[PDB]
Amino acid sequence: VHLTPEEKSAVTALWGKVNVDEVGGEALGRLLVVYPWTQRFFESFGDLSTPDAVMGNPKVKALGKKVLGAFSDGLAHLDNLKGTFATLSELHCDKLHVDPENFRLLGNVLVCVLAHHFGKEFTPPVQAAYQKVVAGVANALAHKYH
Amino acid sequence: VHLTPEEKSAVTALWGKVNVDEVGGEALGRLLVVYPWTQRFFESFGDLSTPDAVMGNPKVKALGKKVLGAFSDGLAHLDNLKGTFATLSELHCDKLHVDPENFRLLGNVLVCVLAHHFGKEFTPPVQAAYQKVVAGVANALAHKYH
Amino acid sequence: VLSPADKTNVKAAWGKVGAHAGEYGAEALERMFLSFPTTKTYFPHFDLSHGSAQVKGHGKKVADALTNAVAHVDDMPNALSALSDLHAHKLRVDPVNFKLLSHCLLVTLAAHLPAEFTPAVHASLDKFLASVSTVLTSKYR
Amino acid sequence: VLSPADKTNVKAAWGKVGAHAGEYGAEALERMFLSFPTTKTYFPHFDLSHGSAQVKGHGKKVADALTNAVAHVDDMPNALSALSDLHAHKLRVDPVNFKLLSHCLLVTLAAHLPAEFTPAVHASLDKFLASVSTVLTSKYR
Numbered sequence A, B: 001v002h003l004t005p006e007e008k009s010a011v012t013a014l015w016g017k018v019n020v021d022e023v024g025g026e027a028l029g030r031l032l033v034v035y036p037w038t039q040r041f042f043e044s045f046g047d048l049s050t051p052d053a054v055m056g057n058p059k060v061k062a063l064g065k066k067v068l069g070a071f072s073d074g075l076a077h078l079d080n081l082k083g084t085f086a087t088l089s090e091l092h093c094d095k096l097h098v099d100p101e102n103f104r105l106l107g108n109v110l111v112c113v114l115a116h117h118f119g120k121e122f123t124p125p126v127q128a129a130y131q132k133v134v135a136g137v138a139n140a141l142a143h144k145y146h
Numbered sequence C, D: 001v002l003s004p005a006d007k008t009n010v011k012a013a014w015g016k017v018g019a020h021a022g023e024y025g026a027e028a029l030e031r032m033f034l035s036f037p038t039t040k041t042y043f044p045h046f047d048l049s050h051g052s053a054q055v056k057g058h059g060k061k062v063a064d065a066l067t068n069a070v071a072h073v074d075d076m077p078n079a080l081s082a083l084s085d086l087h088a089h090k091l092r093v094d095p096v097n098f099k100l101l102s103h104c105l106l107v108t109l110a111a112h113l114p115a116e117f118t119p120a121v122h123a124s125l126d127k128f129l130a131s132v133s134t135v136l137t138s139k140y141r
Ligand code: HEM
Pocket: A038, A041, A042, A066, A067, A070, A071, A088, A092, A096, A098, A102, A103, A106, A107, A137, A138, A141
């Protein structure tokens, strides 16, 4: 199901314009705000009591940056997402017990964040390509459950 | 995540006692009754207007038998469910466009049917083993989406 | 939406559980912990092995909540309001997990009530447990 | 459960869509068909390519339904009752698909309303579309 050359182009062009210090934290922050049960995994992160607290929380932004880097990784290895995500899969599945449905949600949140930030540049074909990516990443990250 | 020897034993002992002419149709019938949108894929099957109509519908029982045979197949190749289910995956995904969430539901329906039919013999460890199986089958059947 | 038939079916299926209610609740929990290991993490103060008095005690409380739902099936949001607050606000239970427990409750009923668990009654029970699950996940904020 | 803030947020976000409502509805459909090809099967009498007058016309009807939901946000089951019957009984739409369209509606709003789509407003909209989806899937039997 993976990307056509045209989709790869669309995806890399847009991703090149992404601020890697902000977008990851924006996505993680929104996950915590929009799907509040996810906060259960972040009891050590301090103040998450309001949308503003969550988005400006430095631990959230820091972790977000790491998440975005994994997506970047993923983008660079679309043909071996399983190997790329093995250690992360062990972590999130074997150690953390995160339900894999949450991997789908985070990926979709990231898609919403890209739409918010690129607006009309984030066309329906461009989103279609990105959905393949986030689906791929989610599936790979869930591998330890399969 | 696959089966321990103890789980394989539990699973094969029980499966040996399954009536292969009835259990498949019972599961498919119940899917159609419990999750009625699934009926959309069976417009040619005739009368599905009541629970009794569905369960005694000969096309449902016939197809059910084929479904059970695929599970049986699966049981015989737990180490290569992907290859075993390739042609079925092409069918259900590329041709039929069945949402893969429905593969999980059918597997769980089959688990409920086994519990109904074996009662106390269908212990929690025995169900645990079977959930691994139906999860495996569902994931393999969905491969064309991944 | 629960039909009159659904309400009748659920009332009748549950009525047959009788004094076994607590036991079946514990059984469903055990089936969930074994089949779906991710759910175990919610109970670190519980020993989750077979015959656990904690799981037993907890099964009774789960059953009591369901019984409360059956008895007030037309007013379930109100009836389980405290519980919905608890599960969303304090416990922060992942909504996916309600589907897992609901499945295991169905499996437990099936294994104990062969006469009652017809396809129609199976469907009513599923809708019932989904409505309960809906209420219990309605309080995220 | 939709909070007063949610209702306010959704009313405000939607209010900014103005004359673009039909267009955004069509856009969301297009995003859904492209990103999630399984959903295309529900529209064999539709040509689903870009600029399709059918998708356009249909986007207007979808938007009208959402607007009806916003205007009657405290009475949504009643307000969308006809539509729930249609989607469950005639159309037999898989409930998973409501999540897909809801996502694409969120993406469409995000792409068009940069000022409005804050994290808080994002959460309100998600809950809103989930409540709509709940009503529209409440009529399986
Ligand atoms: C596409 C989905 C996801 C990706 C790509 C991802 C990626 C990552 C990465 C790169 C780290 C850093 C690991 C390190 O420090 O080496 C991490 C840590 C972590 N993740 Fe995620 N994550 C995802 C989804 C989730 C979700 C949905 C949750 C919770 C609901 C979650 C919970 C955590 C937690 C609690 C940590 C801290 C681990 C630790 O330092 O002990 N992740 N993740």
